[PDB]
Design a protein around this ligand. Structure first.
Ligand SMILES: CCCCCCCC/C=C\CCCCCCCC(=O)OC[C@H](O)CO
Ligand SMILES: CCCCCCCC/C=C\CCCCCCCC(=O)OC[C@H](O)CO
Ligand SMILES: *C\C=C(C)/C=C/C=C(C)/C=C/C1=C(C)CCCC1(C)C
Ligand SMILES: CCCCCCCC/C=C\CCCCCCCC(=O)O
Ligand SMILES: CCCCCCCC/C=C\CCCCCCCC(=O)O
Ligand SMILES: CCCCCCCC/C=C\CCCCCCCC(=O)O
Ligand SMILES: CCCCCCCC/C=C\CCCCCCCC(=O)O
Ligand SMILES: CCCCCCCC/C=C\CCCCCCCC(=O)O
Length: 263
């Protein structure tokens, strides 16, 4: 599965290779550092919204484990031989990120629907359609990147299908946001709209990294992809979770929950 990604096609200078290593290991620290934050502030969240901060904790560990896994796979697969790091074993692939997205994405959507104050039949119903839409997006995206070396044509086609799901997923999310923001407390009706636009931006970096094989097929394209993934992870998971947390607390305060009001 690794011989199918462009990471296996190139040698890397010590600078390119250590930069990629430091990106992944930094992501681990950021994610686990934020996990502690979400764990601490959970006590300041009303039971109605407390599940939202817990799903962030799940996202943080899910991300940190796979970034940690990627970092160790990166240093196992390459060895500095004759002035460059060269592939040794076949143990590094990006497919492990797509497995991470399969898990974290439902949690990210869930935490959104919860602070939107959906409940009951609508929560279950809206969650089912979004998760299925997201899984169709992720799965077709995973199949396309298997061809990122061999058949760029198939990458583009599977990329097109994946984007169809992505567009439908966003129209559902946005529609639920704009039709349910008048229900949000403490002024969080204004914050949620900005969260939606934070999503649009952060999530759109992924398909751009997905296309790096097609417009920058060299060792600097590999660095660029990881840099885009790192920016995207931090905004779609950390910053997004922080703002979800703030909305969960603000509404808890406006709802009379004392620990939130005292914070
Ligand atoms: C031909 C080969 C087979 C191709 C097969 C894939 C093509 C269908 C792709 C997208 C349709 C998505 C439409 C399904 C979503 C409609 C339901 C929905 O979105 O409901 C949300 C609602 O707002 C919550 O209550
Ligand atoms: C790969 C080939 C396929 C490419 C074709 C892509 C077409 C892009 C069109 C729309 C994007 C929709 C973005 C979703 C933004 C949601 C806006 C929204 O939800 O509308 C407001 C709401 O309905 C009020 O209640
Ligand atoms: C870590 C959190 C999130 C939300 C990751 C999201 C990933 C996407 C929105 C990926 C999208 C793709 C598209 C739209 C088409 C090319 C294939 C991708 C799966 C990379
Ligand atoms: C406070 C919580 C912050 C602590 C999180 C950071 C902990 C240790 C991260 C180190 C993992 C390094 C992975 C090995 C790969 C490598 O470094 O080459
Ligand atoms: C088709 C794949 C299955 C996906 C189905 C998604 C299931 C989601 C179900 C409801 C989410 C409920 C969230 C947990 C309870 C918190 C709600 C609350 O107490 O306010
Ligand atoms: C772990 C549960 C996986 C979810 C399965 C149910 C939802 C699937 C959603 C869309 C399926 C898209 C079809 C992808 C299969 C074709 C790719 C291939 O050739 O193998
Ligand atoms: C993730 C992006 C989703 C959108 C993908 C856009 C689809 C691009 C459209 C096709 C342009 C024509 C493709 C040219 C042929 C290239 C394949 C080949 O080299 O054999
Ligand atoms: C399930 C959702 C749609 C799947 C459409 C599959 C089309 C991609 C075929 C590309 C190929 O395998 O040659």
């Amino acid at each position: 599965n690794s011989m199918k990604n462009i990471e296996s096609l190139f040698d890397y200078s010590a600078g390119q290779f250590e930069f990629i290593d430091h990106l992944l290991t930094m992501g681990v620290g950021v994610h686990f550092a934020a996990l502690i934050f979400f764990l601490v502030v959970s006590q300041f969240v009303a039971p109605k919204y407390r599940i939202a901060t817990a799903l962030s904790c799940i996202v943080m560990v899910s991300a940190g484990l796979i970034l940690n896994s990627q970092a160790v796979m990166w240093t196992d697969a390459y060895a500095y031989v004759d002035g460059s790091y060269q592939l040794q074993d076949l143990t590094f692939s990006n497919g492990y990120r797509y497995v991470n997205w399969m898990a974290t994405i439902p949690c990210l959507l869930l935490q959104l629907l919860i602070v939107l104050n959906l409940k009951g039949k609508e929560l279950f119903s809206t969650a089912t359609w979004l998760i299925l839409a997201a899984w169709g997006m992720i799965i077709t995206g995973y199949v396309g990147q298997l061809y990122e070396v061999d058949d760029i044509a198939q990458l583009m086609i599977w990329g097109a299908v994946s984007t169809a799901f992505f567009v439908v997923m966003n129209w559902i999310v946005g529609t639920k946001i704009f039709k349910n923001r008048a229900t949000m407390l403490g002024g969080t009706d204004s914050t949620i709209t900005k969260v939606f636009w934070l999503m649009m931006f952060a999530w759109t970096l992924y398909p751009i990294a997905y296309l790096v094989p097609a417009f920058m097929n060299n060792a600097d394209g590999v660095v660029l992809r990881q840099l885009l993934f790192t920016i995207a992870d931090i905004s779609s998971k950390v910053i997004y979770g922080l703002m979800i947390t703030y909305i969960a607390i603000q509404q808890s305060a406006a709802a009379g929950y004392v620990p939130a009001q005292q914070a």
